[PDB]
Design a binder for this molecule. Structure first.
Ligand SMILES: CC(=O)N[C@H]1[C@@H](OP(=O)(O)OP(=O)(O)OC[C@H]2O[C@@H](n3ccc(=O)[nH]c3=O)[C@H](O)[C@@H]2O)O[C@H](CO)[C@@H](O)[C@@H]1O
Length: 450
């Protein structure tokens, strides 16, 4: 049996991509052990009931958890120190077992794992879960060719589209941690000389030239994305309709029946992000702008954010809008009545829109969302970004006009045609013989040779 370890960043918001990749690997005959923390094992249902199910290895005792008194630097230092010892202790045992691991695939945000693997003589590779465009930006910040505030009005990197400073990732949302955040991201490219491979959560037709640029750094690059459940793509992995490893228990849904009565391609699905907080002022303009379009809309917004909606808003859109606390985003985007997706452009949501063929109204808020939005509008051409003013407020007029332009304007047919092409190309990449399937097959072949 060929056995490997997968070690994602141990957070709910960061583990889905390699859980999905793990499922593609076990479908090809690889035995996978998920290395993780007590916290993740307690909050997620990771155990499958089958012979080839991902094996869960909890290697921590919770002492690596953040304390309320920490600066981000202190939390990161304690995590690295304790998890370095935890991984060393785990490999001490695993490397002398009956079927020792032959490789460790780890999140790119834990670059310290490479030095542990190096000491043990264990093959290893980081997984970059975000876009390949972010790899180029972060690499250029590490090597001095770019700065956190761009020193120039325009940015022309190699094999990339032109970027304005507003298109660059915004991580100054927490000004005391900005320096720590940039050091961690730039540290993901520092030790790649010793990586067996570099894995990226993207596909060749989506970021081909950037991937080719990344291949000039000296190491083989394997695109294995999009990491979206097989049911919404190639359908080659039996009932894989969710991101997790345990059996899928669907929630009671009020969204699909409502969508069933609406005309095909007519409704705007709205989500500004499951963990994004929006100010009352901005939420009011967003709400009224959607209302002014007169379109049917399905807005998913969590209970603590829903309390910030204007009074009488929900009652005022009783006819055209369904505002709910939760829906299955994949099932909503796959529904034929959904014709546009108002999104914050998180990388997960970006790939879901591309895989499901839905045009977008882009409303990025922080981090890599701004760069993803730039690509959705200006490179992939599946939608438009909401214009904000000199105070960064997107007005209700700016929200309404953007929605109308994507769904009804001169380029509306272009966006739908482009969305349909990307859906076809994303499915092709992960289906048999595709660019991502080939890379996965190549990895599995390499593992079979040890
Ligand atoms: C790529 C990534 O790591 N996350 C992105 C984003 O979220 P991301 O793009 O992951 O967006 P969400 O947090 O909204 O979604 C998380 C997951 O929950 C699902 N979902 C969400 C809401 C809902 O009602 N139902 C549902 O099923 C989505 O399909 C997705 O798979 O997180 C940050 C937002 O602060 C971004 O900076 C990240 O780039």
């Amino acid at each position: 049996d060929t056995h490997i370890l997968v070690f994602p960043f141990p957070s709910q918001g960061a583990i889905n991509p390699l859980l999905q990749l793990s499922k593609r690997l076990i479908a090809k005959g690889i035995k996978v052990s998920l290395v993780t923390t007590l916290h993740v094992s307690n909050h997620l249902q990771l155990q499958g009931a089958y012979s080839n199910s991902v094996k869960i290895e909890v290697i921590s005792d919770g002492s690596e958890d953040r304390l309320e008194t920490d600066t981000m630097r202190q939390t990161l230092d304690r995590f690295r120190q304790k998890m370095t010892k935890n991984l060393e202790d785990f490999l001490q045992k695993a490397m002398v077992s009956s079927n020792p691991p032959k490789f460790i695939l780890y999140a790119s945000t834990m670059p310290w794992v490479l030095e542990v693997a190096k000491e043990f003589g264990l093959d290893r590779a980081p997984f970059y879960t975000q876009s390949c465009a972010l790899n180029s930006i972060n690499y250029h910040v590490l090597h001095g060719q770019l700065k956190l505030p761009p020193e120039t009005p325009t940015i022309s990197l190699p094999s990339m589209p032109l970027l304005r400073p507003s298109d660059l990732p915004a991580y100054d949302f927490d000004p005391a941690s900005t320096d720590t955040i940039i050091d961690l991201l730039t540290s993901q490219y520092s030790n790649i000389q010793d990586a067996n491979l570099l894995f990226c959560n993207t596909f060749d037709k989506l970021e081909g030239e950037i991937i080719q640029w990344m291949e000039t750094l000296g190491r083989p690059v394997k695109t294995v994305g999009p990491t979206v459940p097989s049911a919404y793509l190639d359908k080659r992995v039996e009932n894989d309709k969710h991101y997790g490893l345990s059996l899928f228990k669907p929630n009671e849904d009020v969204c699909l029946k409502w969508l069933d009565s609406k005309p095909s391609g007519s409704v705007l699905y709205v989500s500004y992000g499951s963990l994004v907080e929006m100010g009352e002022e901005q939420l009011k303009e967003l709400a009224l702008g959607i209302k002014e379009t007169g379109k049917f809309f399905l807005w998913v917004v969590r209970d603590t954010e829903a309390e910030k909606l204007p009074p009488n808003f929900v009652e005022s859109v009783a006819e055209k809008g369904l505002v709910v606390s939760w829906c299955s985003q994949l099932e909503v985007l796959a529904h034929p009545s959904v014709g546009c997706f108002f999104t914050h452009c998180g990388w997960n949501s970006t790939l879901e829109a591309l895989c499901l063929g839905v045009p977008v109204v882009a409303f990025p808020q922080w981090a890599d969302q701004v760069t993803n939005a730039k690509f959705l509008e200006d490179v992939w051409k599946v939608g438009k970004r909401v214009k904000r003013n000199e105070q960064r407020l997107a007005s209700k007029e700016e929200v309404r006009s953007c929605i109308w332009e994507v769904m009804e304007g001169e380029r509306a047919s272009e966006f739908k045609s482009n969305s349909m092409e990307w859906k076809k190309w994303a499915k092709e990449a992960v289906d048999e013989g595709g660019s991502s399937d080939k890379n996965i097959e190549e990895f599995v072949a390499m593992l079979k040779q040890t």
